[PDB]
Structure formats: structure tokens, C-alpha cells
Design a protein around this nucleic acid. Structure first.
Length: 114
DNA sequence: TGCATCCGTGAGTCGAGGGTAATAAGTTGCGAGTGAAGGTTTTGTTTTGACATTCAGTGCTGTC
């Protein structure tokens, strides 16, 4: 029942509030108990990383800002830490992703509309 | 003691519109130097064996 409210706030707050699990522990419950409370609902929450990589991927293709704002806008640690997450997930360079004139759904994790 | 032959000064602030013209040899080599161009070079930038580490994904256990 209760932690429905985490789902689309996370659609809205992968932004300027740097939310970690202890910042996600501000949703009422503990660090370890929110995990399995999210697990049997969804199957897959720390999804957040995907939204961070999905949520950064609105900035590559659909806004004209270059790459250095992107690795620090949507709450990743660094430009290699971004591309470490990028290459584990999308298996590309984002300089080889946005510059390419074609773009399809290989690595971009969907948001949970459960 | 003149005789002239040159030297060197004539106030002070603003406004004023814009400005130059005479004349003239060619032909010939050859050297030093502005470009375009050979893209390769020194320096900006991309991923993988892995481990101390933070951490999130597994179930567990414990309480009120």
C-alpha cells in the first residue's frame, strides 16, 4: 500500500535533490526494509540508477547542452562514473550515441508505470 | 662717434567648415618569399583484466 508515493516523485526527483537510499529512507521506513517492500511489488529500487541514466538521456538527444553538464545534472558522480554506468548499460560511448543519427531502445531502462 | 645691417617680441579662452596638387621607359632574368597544400607528429579524448570499497539486491530475524 504505502510506498506508491516513491514511484513518480522519483520521476520528478532524480534532479537537484541528491537522493541516496538514506535520503530514500526519508520515505518513512528504514534502509533495509524499503528494499523488499519495493521488491515484491516490482521485481526489480536503487531502477533509480536507470532513471538517472534514462533521465540523463533526455539531455543528450533532446537538449543542445554538451556532455559535461549531463554527468553532474542528474546526480551521477563524475564523467567517467557516468560513462562507467553508460558502457555497462548501453555499451556505447555517449559521444558515439548522440552523434549517431539513429537511436533505438537497446539499453534505456523504462520507467516503472507498474 | 656714427652707419647700417640684421635680430626678434606684439594678451587670453571657446567655436569653423575640410582641403591639394607637376612629372617621368621599357625588357630581362632570377632570387627571396605569401600561399595553398603531404598528412604525420606531441597532446585532447575513448574501454578492459581486476580489488578495497560503497552499496543495493537477496533473505533473515526481532520486536511490539
Amino acid at each position: 500500500g504505502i510506498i506508491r508515493d516513491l514511484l513518480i516523485w522519483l520521476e520528478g526527483h532524480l534532479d537537484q535533490p541528491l537522493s541516496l537510499d538514506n535520503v530514500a529512507a526519508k520515505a518513512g521506513y528504514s534502509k533495509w526494509h524499503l528494499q523488499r517492500m519495493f521488491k515484491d511489488v516490482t521485481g526489480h529500487i536503487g531502477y533509480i540508477r536507470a532513471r538517472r541514466l534514462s533521465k540523463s538521456a533526455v539531455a543528450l538527444r533532446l537538449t543542445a547542452r554538451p556532455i559535461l553538464d549531463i554527468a553532474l545534472q542528474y546526480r551521477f558522480d563524475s564523467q567517467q562514473t557516468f560513462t562507467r554506468a553508460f558502457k555497462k548499460q548501453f555499451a556505447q560511448t555517449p559521444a558515439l550515441y548522440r552523434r549517431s543519427p539513429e537511436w533505438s531502445a537497446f539499453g534505456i531502462r523504462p520507467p516503472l508505470r507498474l
